[PDB]
Design a protein around this ligand. Structure first.
Ligand SMILES: *[C@@H]1O[C@H](CO)[C@@H](O[C@@H]2O[C@H](CO)[C@@H](O[C@@H]3O[C@H](CO)[C@@H](O)[C@H](O)[C@@H]3O)[C@H](O)[C@H]2NC(C)=O)[C@H](O)[C@H]1NC(C)=O
Ligand SMILES: *[C@@H]1O[C@H](CO)[C@@H](O[C@@H]2O[C@H](CO)[C@@H](O[C@@H]3O[C@H](CO)[C@@H](O)[C@H](O)[C@@H]3O)[C@H](O)[C@H]2NC(C)=O)[C@H](O)[C@H]1NC(C)=O
Ligand SMILES: [Cu+2]
Ligand SMILES: [Cu+2]
Ligand SMILES: [Cu+2]
Ligand code: NA
Length: 499
């Protein structure tokens, strides 16, 4: 069952064996992935998160981010530790009480403390549209049509060296899959369809690191949504999906009744499909209960290319049709050396006082804010351009902005900008050496918004900055509840920290 929009959510430790190997984890709702939280557009979500964690090897504190939801007027509920709150301590709870005006699509939730979401705290978050403009394109859209893609590690996250190239031990599709080494024939996920029906498959990357080449043997996929943004229909036979991205695609169950492999090939870790790694099963009702015998093609003739995507609505692009054609045009210097990432010469290390609480206590400008050099102010009601030139080791890096979606004016592997009709999204691959992926948005959401690589190991190694958007209006725009004001005193008392 789905839960929400008003629900408790308990965060616990438990052993799980999603690839046949048992390890302890950090779970929401007792499962990996966590239960789907759902509601309708404009609903009030009140997710009361109960921190019941006791195993210090995966951290007993926690904080949860609602990835892709704008949190306008509720910056305090966004979740990134030491940006918008102090963590919730064990044996305490916290009500994330916010609204989702003007958004409908496929999202997810995850821990936003350290690398804790890698240890299991990740699940889908779906905001349905009762008047969806795409409703007539499919028959079925429900919990059975969500497809999650996850990396899974046998080593616990807090044992992963900072700044290292860290590699997974299994790909999990809907929570199940097989290990790349010592492979055992543990259960594969089954996605069941009825011949002749059309499905809204909601594809969610809950990855901590790899991107996946996703395909379904014998089938193609008609994209209708990108990171929450409705798209024109685009039919493809393969989707390369980077960490934290989402797509909806229509699957037409138009092939002969049978079993078909679902494939998700990561960019690192096990390559291919030997022993049923990197695999799940598409089963038609009436098919024999047996593994597929289908083949992938040697090459895919209609892969997704990001410049082919266009919004369903006439979204356009803010600003003027040339580089630097914005009120506030920025170019970030994104670098890596010696185990640490930096942005504009500064490696992110979380501050003791969350950025939002520094601003509510009266800090006047971005040079008053800690960490020094890690906070950039943005002016209100202005067009922002951010160029993100690639080259830093460990690519391709999927960059994500909290509080906002953005026009992708220039995409990976293509030097030509698009000032007319590019897709809007919230997490974008910045590509490879010499690329100049560039995003635009307008500042209508006061508060501190994290900008970071969504390879969680990179975030931990410093690949982040904070956009302090409209500092002067942050306090008036984001009234805080007493339970939020109580978080830092409780956390600092529990950890014997002075502030
Ligand atoms: C990605 O696109 C951005 C623009 O969106 C390019 O930024 C431009 O970068 C050049 C230098 O690489 C800038 O010119 C330099 O300015 C300084 C003074 O600030 C001057 O001392 C130098 O002699 C040089 O003129 C320019 O201001 C900046 N913005 C523009 C042109 O709009 C960036 O180079 C592109 N990166 C890649 C890798 O393609
Ligand atoms: C590299 O990125 C650029 C920019 O996003 C892509 O260029 C765009 O290509 C599209 C598709 O061909 C062009 O749209 C076309 O326009 C005419 C109408 O003028 C229409 O008859 C065609 O059916 C189609 O809609 C678009 O104008 C063009 N934009 C720019 C700024 O050049 C390009 O396709 C990408 N390269 C690759 C290899 O995908
Ligand atoms: Cu995220
Ligand atoms: Cu986010
Ligand atoms: Cu990265
Ligand atoms: Na425009």
């Amino acid at each position: 069952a789905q839960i929400g929009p008003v629900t408790d959510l308990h965060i616990t430790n438990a052993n799980i064996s999603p690839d046949g190997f048992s390890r302890p984890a950090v779970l929401a709702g007792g499962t990996f992935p966590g239960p789907t939280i759902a509601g309708n557009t404009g609903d009030n979500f009140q997710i009361t998160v109960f921190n019941d964690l006791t195993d210090p090897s995966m951290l007993t504190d926690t904080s949860i981010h609602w990835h892709g939801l704008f949190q306008k007027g509720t910056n305090w509920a966004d979740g990134p530790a030491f940006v918008t709150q102090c963590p919730i301590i064990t044996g305490q709870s916290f009500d994330y009480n916010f609204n989702v005006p003007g958004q409908a699509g496929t999202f997810w939730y995850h821990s936003h403390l350290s690398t804790q979401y890698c240890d299991g705290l990740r699940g889908p978050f779906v905001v349905y549209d009762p008047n969806d403009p795409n409703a007539s394109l499919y028959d079925v859209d429900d919990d059975t049509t969500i497809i999650t893609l996850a990396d899974w590690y046998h080593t616990l996250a807090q044992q992963e060296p900072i700044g290292a190239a860290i590699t997974a031990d299994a790909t999990l599709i809907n929570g199940l899959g097989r290990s790349f080494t010592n492979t055992t024939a543990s259960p594969l996920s089954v996605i069941t369809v009825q011949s002749g029906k059309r499905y809204r498959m909601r594809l969610v990357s809950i990855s901590c690191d790899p991107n996946y080449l996703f395909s379904i043997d014998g089938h193609d996929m008609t994209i209708i949504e990108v990171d929450g943004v409705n798209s024109q229909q685009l039919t493809v036979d393969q989707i390369q999906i980077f960490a934290a991205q989402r797509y909806s695609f229509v699957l037409n169950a138009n092939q002969p009744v049978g079993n078909y492999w679902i494939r998700a090939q990561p960019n690192s870790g096990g390559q291919g499909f030997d022993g049923g790694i990197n695999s799940a099963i598409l089963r038609y009702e009436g098919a024999t209960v047996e593994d597929p015998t289908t083949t992938a093609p040697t090459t895919f003739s209609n892969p997704l290319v990001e410049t082919d995507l266009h919004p369903l609505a006439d979204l356009g692009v803010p600003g003027q049709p040339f580089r630097g054609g914005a009120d506030d045009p920025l170019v970030l210097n994104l670098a890596f050396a010696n185990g640490r990432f930096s942005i504009d010469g500064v490696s992110f290390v979380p501050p003791t006082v969350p950025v939002l609480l520094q601003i509510l206590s009266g800090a006047q400008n971005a040079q008053d804010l800690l960490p020094a050099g890690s906070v950039i102010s943005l002016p209100s009601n202005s067009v922002i351009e951010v160029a993100l030139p690639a080259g830093a080791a460990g690519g391709p890096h999927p960059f994500h902005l909290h509080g906002h979606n953005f026009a992708v004016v220039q995409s990976a592997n293509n030097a030509t900008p698009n000032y007319v009709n590019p897709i809007w999204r919230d997490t974008v691959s910045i590509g490879g050496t010499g690329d100049n992926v560039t995003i635009r948005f307008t500042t209508n959401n006061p508060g501190p918004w994290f900008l970071h690589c969504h390879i969680d190991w990179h975030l931990e190694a410093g690949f982040a900055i904070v956009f302090a958007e409209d500092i002067p209006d942050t306090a008036s725009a984001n009234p805080v509840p007493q339970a939020w004001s109580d978080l830092c005193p409780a956390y600092d008392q529990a950890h014997n920290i002075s502030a």
